[PDB]
Amino acid sequence: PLSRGKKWTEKLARFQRSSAKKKR
């Protein structure tokens, strides 16, 4: 299922977090 298939989604939700570190 998507549970273990999220391996592909682990990019938009992982890099989207950088929006908090980009605040410098």
Measure Cα distances from 18 to 6, 7, 9, 10, 11 in Å: 19, 19, 15, 13, 11
Cα angle, residue 7 at apex, residues 4 and 11 outer, rounded to 5° = 145
H or E stretch at 2: helix 2-5
Distance CA 14, CA 6 (A): 11
Phi, psi of 5 (to 5 degrees): -90, -10
Phi, psi of 13 (to 5 degrees): -90, -15
Is residue 15 helix, strand or coil? helix
Taken as a whole, the chain contains a residue count of 24
Q: How was this structure determined?
A: NMR
